[PDB]
Every structure is written in C-alpha cells, then in structure tokens.
Ligand binder design. Structure first.
Ligand SMILES: COC[C@H]1O[C@H](O[C@@H]2C3=C(C(C)C)CC[C@]3(C)/C=C3\[C@@H](CC[C@]3(O)COC)[C@@H](C)[C@H]2O)[C@H](O)[C@H]2O[C@H]3O[C@]21O[C@@]3(C)[C@@H]1CO1
Ligand SMILES: COC[C@H]1O[C@H](O[C@@H]2C3=C(C(C)C)CC[C@]3(C)/C=C3\[C@@H](CC[C@]3(O)COC)[C@@H](C)[C@H]2O)[C@H](O)[C@H]2O[C@H]3O[C@]21O[C@@]3(C)[C@@H]1CO1
Ligand SMILES: [K+]
Ligand SMILES: [K+]
Lengths: 17, 230, 227
C-alpha cells in the first residue's frame, strides 16, 4: 500500500487465466 | 510423491509469476511418461502459453518499431536483428512444446478430450511458428498447424458436446488461424458462427463446473465475429 | 559508436519489456567508464528497478504463502523463497558495485550525485528487506547513503526537483519499514511535500509532471501512515 518512487482491435484466441 | 512435489512447485511458481520455473516443473512432470490429469495439463499449457506469449508480444512491439523507422537505416537495422533474436527464443520455446506433444502427450492421450486438448496445442504452437516464418519454410509449418487443428476439429465434432470449453476453444483458435494465417475471413466467420450457434442450441449441456469457461469462450467467438464483419 | 547503440538497444528492450536485456545494455554503457548522461542514468535506473522489482514481488508472494502454512508444504515455500533471495541479492550486488566502481566516482553534478546515492540507499534497502543478522550492517549502509543524498540535495536542489522529492519519498519509506519509526517517516514526508507546495513557481515544463507525481505519492503515504 505504501509507495516508493515508481518505475516507468485484433483477433482474440483462447485466453490464459 | 515426486510428481506431486513438482506440481506443488509449479503452482508456487505460478503464484510468484515465475513462468519459466512453472514450465520447467510441468515439463518434468510430462517427461515422467504418465498421462497428465486435467489440472496438470491445464498447468502445463498456462505455463508455456505465458513463456511463448512474452516473445510474441515482444515480437509485435519490435516489428511495429522496425516498420515505423523505415527512413532511418541504423534504427531500423537494430530492430531487425533484435526481432531476429526474439524469433529464435520463440522458435525454441515452440519446438520444446511441440516436441513434448509428439513424444509424450499425443500418443498416450487415451480420451477424446485430451487428444483434442493436445492437438489444439499442436495447432497453436505451429500457428505461433507460422506467425514469424518465411517463406517456403512457412508453407509446411502452416500445413502442420492446419492438420493438427483439423484432426482435433473432427474428434471434438464427433466426441464432445458443443458447449465443452475445449471444443469451443479449438473452434476459437482454428477460426483465428483461418483469419490471420490463411487470410480467409469468411471461413473464419463460418467456423466461429457455427461453434457459437451450436453451443447456443445446447445450453442445457453446461454443468456448474464448465459454464464459466464455455460462456467466456462463446463471448470471444462472437467478439471475433463482430470484429471480422466490421 | 558502441555506447550510442547500446543505449538505442536498451530503449528497444524497454519497449519490448525485456528488462534483463535493458539492464545488460545499460550495464555495458556504465562499464565503459564515462559519466552517464541523464537519459542514460534514467534508463539504467528503470532497467534495474524492473529486474529487482520482479524478485521483490515474487518474494512477497512466496514468503506470504510460507507464513500462512504453519508443516512441510512450508519447507517447499521456504526453499523457493531462498532461491528468489539469492537472485535478488545477486542483482542488488551487481548494482551496488556499479555505483561504487563507476557511477558515484564520476558524478560531476549535485543532481547526479544525489541520484546515485539514492540508488545506493535503495539497493541496500532491498537487501535489507530480505536480510536477518548481517542485517544491522546493511541497514546502516542504506541509511548513510540516503543521508548523504539528503544533505547534498537540501543544499543544492530546489524542493520541487523530482530527484530531491523522490529521495525524500524513499528515505521516508526506509524510516517506516526498515527502522520501524513511523513518526520520522511522516516528518520527512510532510516536510518534503510542504516545501514543494510553497514553491510551485520553481517547476519547469520539463519537470513538473514527475514532481507532482512524487508529491502525490508523498502525501498518499502520509495519509496511509496517519489514517
Ligand atoms: C490451470 O488452471 C487454469 C484454468 O483451467 C481450467 O480452464 C481451462 C483454461 C482456461 C479457461 C479460463 C478458459 C484458459 C486456460 C485453460 C487452461 C486452457 C484452455 C481451455 C480451452 C482449451 C484451452 O485453451 C487449452 O488449449 C489446449 C480449457 C481447458 C479451460 O477449461 C479451469 O476451468 C479454470 O478454472 C480455474 O482453473 C482455470 O482457471 C481458473 C483459475 C479460474 C477460471 O479462472
Ligand atoms: C527512461 O526514463 C524514464 C523517465 O525518466 C525521467 O523521470 C525520472 C523517473 C521517473 C519519473 C516517471 C517519476 C520514474 C523513474 C525515474 C527514471 C526515476 C527517478 C525519478 C526520481 C528519482 C528516481 O526514482 C531515480 O532515483 C534513483 C526522476 C529521475 C524522474 O525525473 C523523465 O523525466 C520521465 O519522462 C519520460 O522519461 C521518464 O518517463 C517518461 C517516459 C515519461 C514520464 O513517462
Ligand atoms: K495454447
Ligand atoms: K530505484
């Protein structure tokens, strides 16, 4: 929950959970 | 007990999002030579789909950059060779899976349901190779993908209910292969529309355990139909 | 030259989300011995934070699973944890050694000296999240890095500078999670936010987005820690 400094259509086939 | 440990590790790897570890564990389970349970083959396919999926996603990003840097010779060449390096990892992962399928999974699959599962997977990983093959190599790879899907399509049509997630998932992917790989939108739409309508006709065949997967894949089938019409 | 294209490659790895390749490129740049530019050190920072971030994330998951299972499923989780810790320590060691050998010695401006000492502080702190002794020595090394960073930035940088603010954000978290002093974490965070709010005219068009983002995070932590 506490933050430190951050980092930073097509066809659908069968998804992957 | 050993296999049960390997499976527990795979689930641990999955929760820690370490998909290389998860795939290594399930490949070891597979190489013990026994038929996988439902959960095991589901884990094996989740793990490998994530591993290959990262390269496919990387490959599309790098291709898009290689195209949009047409005029800048240095930038565009660096992209071409980064792409080629990704393609190599991608083919190795595809070959690893296809080799597990040929050597252990398919020949020992004693139920229509698991035969279709593994042939779908075969149609899938050749599809992934066809995504980055050229140009006379591409032809036999496209053919390998289509045959695997065609056999799985015939078994499932004959042995499985239309609402079965595996039968629906095969239709989904096989329809994607027609659209994307063979540029046949109408065949793709025909395949998906039929699978959707045949499942709609038999909605009393869903069980409490199946339905959420089935209805998800139906929605995906119709999403593609919508997309492919307009 | 070599450097210019290792950097371009780093940027391409980044867009492809291949952060091990990004880190390996930026590590080679660093090892050429020349002072990094701002873009180069930012790329180095992003690459390694992603590489180490994946381990910390996995570590928190596995360790939590282990703590929730009391008595041999527990063992499995423990040994997986330790394997992840080793990866994580190797990564932090790799970075700390780049800082000591190449980066901190060559830094010719206050801005970039503060940046590297903040990194040194952060990577010692990641080693701390996962240490037990040994640990006391590690915490002290993190604290001394952030402290020197914090002294230099107070003297050399505007209160709205993103580096100065981000240093305050991480030093604050260090006080809270590592030294278990909520009050000192809140005071560091509160002062850094208030001093930036009083001087919003010192924002550049180039910097303001970064600055205001870290301001929000500083306050969010303060909210979390008091409410
Ligand atoms: C490792 O298990 C993952 C997956 O396997 C099962 O789902 C399979 C599954 C899915 C679902 C979510 C649509 C996506 C991955 C997986 C494993 C794969 C396939 C589908 C249809 C064919 C499949 O593509 C495999 O192709 C060879 C078939 C085999 C699906 O039944 C299971 O019901 C889901 O319930 C939980 O477990 C499943 O995901 C759950 C966590 C619930 C849905 O979130
Ligand atoms: C590869 O660099 C990424 C990052 O570097 C810069 O941002 C730094 C930065 C951020 C920003 C998004 C808040 C997060 C990572 C990075 C590089 C790091 C740090 C902040 C504050 C101190 C920092 O944690 C490094 O500490 C060692 C300072 C050095 C930030 O200025 C730059 O301005 C951003 O604009 C673009 O580029 C930056 O992100 C952009 C793509 C824009 C914001 O999306
Ligand atoms: K698949
Ligand atoms: K950092």
């Amino acid at each position: 929950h506490r933050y430190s400094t951050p980092h930073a259509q097509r066809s659908t086939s069968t998804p992957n959970v | 007990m050993d296999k049960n440990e390997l499976v527990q590790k795979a689930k641990l790897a999955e929760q820690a999002e370490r998909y290389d570890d998860m795939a290594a564990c399930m490949k070891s389970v597979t190489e013990q030579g026994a038929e996988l349970s439902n959960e095991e083959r589901n884990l094996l396919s989740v793990a490998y789909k994530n591993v290959v999926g990262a390269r496919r996603s990387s490959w599309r990003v790098v291709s898009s950059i290689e195209q949009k840097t047409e005029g800048a010779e240095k930038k565009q060449q660096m992209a071409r060779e980064y792409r080629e390096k990704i393609e190599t990892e991608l083919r190795d992962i595809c070959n690893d899976v296809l080799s597990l399928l040929e050597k252990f999974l398919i020949p020992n699959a004693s139920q229509a349901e698991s035969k279709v599962f593994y042939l779908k997977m075969k149609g899938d990983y050749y599809r992934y190779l066809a995504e980055v093959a050229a140009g006379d190599d591409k032809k036999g790879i496209v053919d390998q993908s289509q045959q695997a899907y065609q056999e799985a399509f015939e078994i499932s049509k004959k042995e499985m209910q239309p609402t079965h997630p595996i039968r629906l998932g095969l239709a989904l992917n096989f329809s994607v292969f027609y659209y994307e790989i063979l540029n046949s939108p109408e065949k793709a739409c025909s395949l998906a529309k039929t699978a959707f309508d045949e499942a709609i006709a038999e909605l009393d065949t869903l069980s409490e355990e199946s339905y959420k997967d089935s209805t998800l894949i139906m929605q995906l089938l119709r999403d593609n139909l919508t997309l492919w019409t307009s």
